[PDB]
């Protein structure tokens, strides 16, 4: 599982677009008396030529940007989770069935757990959502849609098997010891001398 | 629940990630040059604030690519706040931290340089950090510091936060141009060299000279960056020898190390102020000629009086 482009992406570029919309306003022309003021025989320093002054000059004070990295911050930091999510997929093609096995050998009945949050970690997935949109940050799940649904299924349709083999195996058990001991009680020996 | 074990348990091999390598250095002073020039582009865009770089870091000899995360921080101290935002208790064991030292303008590097000494520090302890942690941090640090192969004393690593720190030094080439424009003298290098490399020392670090116009290190910083942040196999020596371009690895400097250096100037000993040894830059820009203001008609008419009144 890719990002085609990194995660470090979805934070460079909205950085750019913070800087677009403050040079928006920031590289606005000083005013300046220079035009005949000569006196200053001096190429213009970039930091008054430009006004490159306006954030030292916040009404409210550095919380704007305080505020403004914090949305990013948060942007970013919560759909990396997500990422995440998706990435724990990763073990459906690199991944030992019989360590699970191992794991969890005769379980509650064999798994009777796993297999319930399964069908919750079908999540983030098997919807008719094909890419997942969060403020201006869309990832689009669309090359792995199928792929990883077709693995995810075939796992899941393997492990449902074995429970239900085991299952029925316990359900052998079940039914012929039941017939055993209903044929015992059925002897029906109620009065005896010995 | 149990799939975020099961799952999770099935890890395969990889490479570290998630390292925040973090500049502040005094502002104009071509960071954002350097760092730009290093990650393959020319130069990027400069701006305010923090801003991000991320470094595409792709070994060979395992084929694999990973990025770093440069948070390269404006110089103004208004501006030191957002700091919070680039390190974090999660972030902090993995950050390798280097300062802009542009040689171009000496007089303002060493309490510049200074300036991290209480910045850094103040963002370290006011996000509290455990003192478990930041000690044994602190002891793997001085650790890995003793350990160079290609120390103790009084003054080293006497204050550090246990992170690798390096001193890289951009805007090299100028010193030939102060060297003339300014008769700058050699002893003057030596002096900054020796009081630079003290610096480092009892801060641990690992200090670079390099030139963006020259093109020089950039090689040697990549491959130092890459050493300290993930652990590649390094073989670049000590390149000491020659005064253009100086390379001190974290752990090959040592007290006598210096002394070698003070000895060769004999002009003024080095344990005088750092801004008395060097000249001080002259401002250029006049002050504004001065308010023409016009006598208010109440003095006006009040001294009026006074030459109706002697009459």
Same mark, same amino acid.
């Given at each position: 599982? @890719?990002?085609?482009?990194?995660?470090?992406?979805?934070?460079?570029?909205?950085?750019?677009?913070?800087?677009?919309?403050?040079?928006?306003?920031?590289?606005?022309?000083?005013?300046?008396? &220079?035009?005949?003021?000569?006196?200053?025989?001096?190429?213009?320093?970039?930091?008054?030529?430009?006004?490159?002054?306006?954030?030292?000059?916040?009404?409210?004070?550095?919380?704007?940007?305080?505020?403004? @990295?914090?949305?990013?911050?948060?942007?970013?930091?919560?759909?990396?989770?997500?990422?995440?999510?998706?990435?724990?997929? &990763?073990?459906?093609?690199?991944?030992?069935?019989?360590?699970?096995?191992?794991?969890?050998?005769?379980?509650?009945?064999?798994?009777?757990?796993?297999?319930?949050?399964?069908?919750?970690?079908?999540?983030?997935?098997?919807?008719?959502?094909?890419?997942?949109?969060?403020?201006?940050?869309?990832?689009? @799940?669309?090359?792995?849609?199928?792929?990883?649904?077709?693995?995810?299924?075939?796992?899941?349709?393997?492990?449902?098997?074995?429970?239900?083999?085991?299952?029925?195996?316990?359900?052998?058990?079940?039914?012929?010891?039941?017939?055993?001991?209903?044929?015992?009680?059925?002897?029906?020996?109620?009065?005896?001398?010995? | 629940?149990?799939?975020?074990?099961?799952?999770?348990?099935?890890?395969?091999?990889?490479?570290?990630?998630?390292?925040? #390598?973090?500049?502040?250095?005094?502002?104009?002073?071509?960071?954002?040059?350097?760092?730009?020039?290093?990650?393959?582009?020319?130069?990027?865009?400069?701006?305010?604030?923090?801003?991000?770089?991320? %470094?595409?870091?792709? !070994?060979? !000899?395992?084929?694999?690519?990973?990025?770093?995360?440069?948070?390269?921080?404006?110089?103004?101290?208004?501006?030191?706040? %957002? /700091?919070?935002?680039?390190?974090?208790?999660?972030?902090?064991?993995?950050?390798?931290?280097?300062?802009?030292?542009?040689?171009?303008?000496?007089?303002?590097?060493?309490?510049?340089?200074?300036?991290?000494?209480?910045?850094?520090?103040?963002?370290?302890?006011?996000?509290? #950090?455990?003192?478990?942690?930041?000690?044994?941090?602190?002891?793997?640090?001085?650790?890995?510091?003793?350990?160079?192969?290609?120390?103790?004393?009084?003054?080293?690593?006497?204050?550090?936060?246990?992170?690798?720190?390096?001193? =890289?030094?951009?805007?090299?080439?100028?010193?030939?141009?102060?060297?003339?424009?300014?008769?700058?003298?050699?002893?003057?290098? !030596?002096?900054?060299?020796?009081?630079?490399?003290?610096?480092? %020392?009892?801060?641990?670090?690992?200090? #670079?000279?390099?030139?963006?116009?020259?093109?020089?290190?950039?090689?040697? %910083?990549?491959?130092?960056? =890459?050493?300290?942040?993930?652990?590649?196999?390094?073989?670049?020596?000590? /390149?000491? =020898?020659?005064? !253009?371009?100086?390379?001190?690895?974290?752990?090959?400097?040592?007290?006598?190390?210096?002394?070698?250096?003070?000895?060769?100037?004999?002009?003024?000993?080095?344990?005088?102020?750092?801004?008395?040894? #060097?000249?001080?830059?002259?401002?250029?820009?006049?002050?504004?000629?001065?308010? /023409?203001?016009?006598?208010?008609?109440?003095?006006?008419?009040?001294?009026?009086?006074?030459?109706?009144?002697?009459?």
């Amino acid at each position: 599982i @890719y990002l085609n482009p990194p995660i470090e992406e979805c934070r460079y570029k909205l950085y750019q677009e913070m800087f677009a919309w403050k040079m928006v306003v920031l590289s606005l022309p000083r005013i300046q008396s &220079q035009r005949y003021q000569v006196g200053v025989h001096y190429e213009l320093t970039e930091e008054e030529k430009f006004y490159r002054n306006a954030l030292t000059r916040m009404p409210d004070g550095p919380v704007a940007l305080e505020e403004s @990295y914090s949305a990013v911050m948060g942007i970013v930091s919560e759909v990396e989770q997500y990422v995440k999510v998706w990435l724990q997929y &990763q073990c459906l093609w690199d991944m030992q069935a019989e360590n699970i096995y191992n794991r969890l050998g005769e379980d509650l009945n064999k798994w009777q757990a796993l297999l319930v949050q399964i069908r919750k970690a079908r999540g983030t997935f098997d919807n008719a959502e094909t890419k997942k949109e969060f403020g201006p940050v869309v990832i689009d @799940y669309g090359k792995v849609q199928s792929k990883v649904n077709l693995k995810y299924d075939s796992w899941h349709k393997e492990v449902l098997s074995k429970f239900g083999q085991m299952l029925g195996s316990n359900m052998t058990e079940f039914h012929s010891q039941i017939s055993k001991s209903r044929q015992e009680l059925e002897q029906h020996s109620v009065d005896t001398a010995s | 629940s149990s799939i975020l074990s099961e799952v999770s348990t099935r890890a395969r091999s990889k490479l570290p990630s998630g390292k925040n #390598i973090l500049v502040f250095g005094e502002d104009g002073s071509g960071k954002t040059t350097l760092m730009t020039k290093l990650q393959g582009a020319e130069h990027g865009k400069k701006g305010r604030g923090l801003e991000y770089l991320y %470094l595409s870091v792709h !070994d060979e !000899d395992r084929d694999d690519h990973t990025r770093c995360n440069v948070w390269i921080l404006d110089g103004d101290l208004y501006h030191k706040g %957002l /700091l919070k935002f680039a390190v974090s208790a999660e972030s902090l064991p993995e950050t390798l931290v280097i300062f802009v030292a542009d040689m171009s303008r000496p007089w303002t590097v060493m309490e510049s340089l200074q300036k991290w000494a209480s910045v850094l520090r103040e963002h370290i302890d006011k996000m509290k #950090i455990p003192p478990e942690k930041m000690r044994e941090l602190e002891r793997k640090f001085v650790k890995d510091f003793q350990d160079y192969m290609e120390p103790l004393g009084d003054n080293v690593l006497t204050h550090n936060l246990g992170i690798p720190v390096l001193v =890289v030094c951009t805007k090299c080439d100028a010193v030939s141009v102060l060297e003339k424009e300014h008769d700058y003298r050699d002893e003057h290098l !030596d002096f900054i060299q020796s009081h630079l490399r003290r610096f480092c %020392l009892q801060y641990g670090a690992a200090l #670079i000279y390099t030139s963006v116009k020259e093109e020089k290190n950039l090689d040697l %910083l990549y491959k130092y960056i =890459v050493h300290k942040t993930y652990g590649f196999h390094f073989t670049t020596p000590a /390149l000491v =020898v020659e005064k !253009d371009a100086v390379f001190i690895p974290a752990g090959w400097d040592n007290e006598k190390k210096i002394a070698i250096l003070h000895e060769n100037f004999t002009t003024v000993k080095p344990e005088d102020a750092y801004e008395d040894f #060097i000249v001080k830059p002259p401002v250029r820009k006049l002050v504004h000629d001065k308010e /023409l203001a016009a006598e208010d008609e109440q003095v006006f008419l009040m001294k009026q009086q006074s030459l109706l009144a002697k009459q």
